[PDB]
Amino acid sequence: ALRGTVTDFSGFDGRADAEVLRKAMKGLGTDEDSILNLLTARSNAQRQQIAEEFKTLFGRDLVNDMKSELAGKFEKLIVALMKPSRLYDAYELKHALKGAGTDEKVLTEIIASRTPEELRAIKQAYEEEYGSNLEDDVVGDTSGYYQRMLVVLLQANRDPDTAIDDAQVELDAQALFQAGELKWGTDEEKFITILGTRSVSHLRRVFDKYMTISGFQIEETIDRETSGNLENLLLAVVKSIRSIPAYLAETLYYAMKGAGTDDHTLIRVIVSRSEIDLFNIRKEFRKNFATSLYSMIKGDTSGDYKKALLLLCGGEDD
Ligand SMILES: [Ca+2]
Ligand SMILES: [Ca+2]
Ligand SMILES: [Ca+2]
Ligand SMILES: [Ca+2]
Ligand SMILES: [Ca+2]
């Protein structure tokens, strides 16, 4: 079902490639082209082996050498590509929190689209890497029901997918109806519990029954009933429940649709999803936005940056 755009290289030789990267950096200037062409053709696993051979061959640190040679978004793109998979989300999260400011957009985006299984691993990796509890970090940096919704999600305790119980579907749709539209105010607590913990297959039926019952799609009520980060969060959750690929295909489009580009988001979704479901994200981007992801990056980016992005992404037509 899920398909990424980057796979393991067939005639892979970690040593052969490490020497190519060395020649490509040794001397005056850089062959950014040989780097980008090499690195976006190996899986993340292979990039780690290559980084290993390099150290053992030259006693130098690949990532630190690149940081020296490259600059701008390209550097940032290659540095994210070098990050081990099991660590990247953890890394992005820690970087969204830390500092005097928080990038709720990152928190929301990652915590809402990742599965319980992925949340668990992300929680481990975070603690072993920065020696901090992820939850404790989030709690400390957020508040309100937004914080609560994130913590509910960080539990990665979403109910399992079993045979759907109609009566139970009816009950949940009517409860959301009473918690929001039929209420003077909102019972955010009921939305959080039902959206945060019910099984995916169950909530998809609840979303449909709720439309039938209210004349509204859950998204419109959320927008009607809530505001700020909590709104964004819940929209995020509802969207991922319906389809992670589509939700990610959407946060990408809005990163570029605007005049400039949000390179940070553009880099994070393509890199993080390159070997999971970036192929699915592409289809859903064409269907829903009429253009292929390719063509879109092709016009919003440039330089080697643009060159690497397009190779990782691939597919002119989608
Ligand atoms: Ca050099
Ligand atoms: Ca630099
Ligand atoms: Ca209301
Ligand atoms: Ca609103
Ligand atoms: Ca643009």
From Swiss-Prot:
InterPro entries, per database record: Annexin, Annexin_repeat, Annexin_repeat_CS, Annexin_sf, ANX5
UniProt entry tagged with the keyword Ubl conjugation: yes
An example Gene Ontology biological process: negative regulation of blood coagulation
Official protein name in the record: Annexin A5
Domain notes: A pair of annexin repeats may form one binding site for calcium and phospholipid.
Glycyl lysine isopeptide (Lys-Gly) (interchain with G-Cter in SUMO2) crosslink, residue number(s): K26
PTM entry text: S-nitrosylation is induced by interferon-gamma and oxidatively-modified low-densitity lipoprotein (LDL(ox)) possibly implicating the iNOS-S100A8/9 transnitrosylase complex.
Designated gene of the protein: Anxa5
Record GO terms (molecular function): calcium ion binding; calcium-dependent phospholipid binding; identical protein binding; P-type calcium transporter activity; peptide hormone binding; phosphatidylserine binding; receptor tyrosine kinase binding
Residue numbers carrying N-acetylalanine: A1
Location of the motif [IL]-x-C-x-x-[DE] motif: 311-317
Known function: This protein is an anticoagulant protein that acts as an indirect inhibitor of the thromboplastin-specific complex, which is involved in the blood coagulation cascade.
Keywords of this entry: Acetylation, Annexin, Blood coagulation, Calcium, Calcium/phospholipid-binding, Hemostasis, Isopeptide bond, Phosphoprotein, Repeat, S-nitrosylation, Ubl conjugation
N6-succinyllysine PTM positions: K287
SUPFAM superfamilies per the UniProt record, alphabetical: Annexin
Family listed: Belongs to the annexin family.
Pfam families assigned: Annexin
